[PDB]
Every structure is written in C-alpha cells, then in structure tokens.
Amino acid sequence: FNDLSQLHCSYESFDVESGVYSVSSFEAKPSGSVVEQAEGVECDFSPLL
Amino acid sequence: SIPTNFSFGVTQEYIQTTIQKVTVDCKQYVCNGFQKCEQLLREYGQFCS
Numbered sequence: 001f002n003d004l005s006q007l008h009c010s011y012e013s014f015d016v017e018s019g020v021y022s023v024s025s026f027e028a029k030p031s032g033s034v035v036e037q038a039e040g041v042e043c044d045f046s047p048l049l
Numbered sequence: 050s051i052p053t054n055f056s057f058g059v060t061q062e063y064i065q066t067t068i069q070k071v072t073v074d075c076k077q078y079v080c081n082g083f084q085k086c087e088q089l090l091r092e093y094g095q096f097c098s
C-alpha cells in the first residue's frame with residue numbers, strides 16, 4: 001500500500017522501532033522510444049514510369 | 050649515557066574509526082523492475098527483510 005506497509009512487513013509486526021529507514025526506490029517513466037541505427041533502401045519504379 | 054643534542058621528532062598516524070555507511074535496496078538491485086522478477090521474488094520474501 002505504501003512505504004509504512006513495506007516497513008511493517010519488513011519487521012513482521014504491527015509495531016516497529018522509530019528511526020530512519022530505507023524503503024524501495026521508484027523510477028521515472030520512459031518518455032518514449034528511439035529507433036535509429038540502420039535504414040533500408042527504396043523500391044525502384046523508374047522503369048515503370 | 051647522556052644525550053647532548055636533540056630534535057623534536059614528528060610522527061603521523063591514522064585510525065580508521067568510521068567505515069562508510071551504506072544502505073541498499075533489495076528489489077531494485079536484484080530485480081531491476083520487471084514484473085515477472087517481482088513475481089519470482091515473493092517466494093523468497095524475507096531475504097530482503
């Protein structure tokens with residue numbers, strides 16, 4: 001549910017000790033994707049035209 | 050045997066009184082935020098605790 005939930009389940013009790021604790025971190029979401037390393041060739045239609 | 054000349058000798062020493070405090074997140078370090086990993090971590094559980 002929250003950081004205190006993780007802290008409570010870390011100590012396996014409803015009561016814990018007062019202090020400073022390290023809870024699991026979080027990550028900024030990726031803004032998108034980029035795909036640029038190799039591009040293909042184009043089909044030829046000049047003999048058609 | 051009595052001295053006649055003297056010097057003020059310096060002497061340096063160091064005491065490692067305090068190693069560097071560290072903390073570590075369990076699931077972020079081991080698991081890298083991919084949901085099947087967290088599903089496969091809950092059985093081990095209290096190792097992080």
Ligand SMILES: *[C@@H]1O[C@H](CO)[C@@H](O)[C@H](O)[C@H]1NC(C)=O
Pocket residue numbers: 053054055
């Ligand atoms: C005592 O030692 C100092 C430094 O080594 C030197 O300059 C001085 O001449 C000495 N004196 C005597 C009496 O040996």
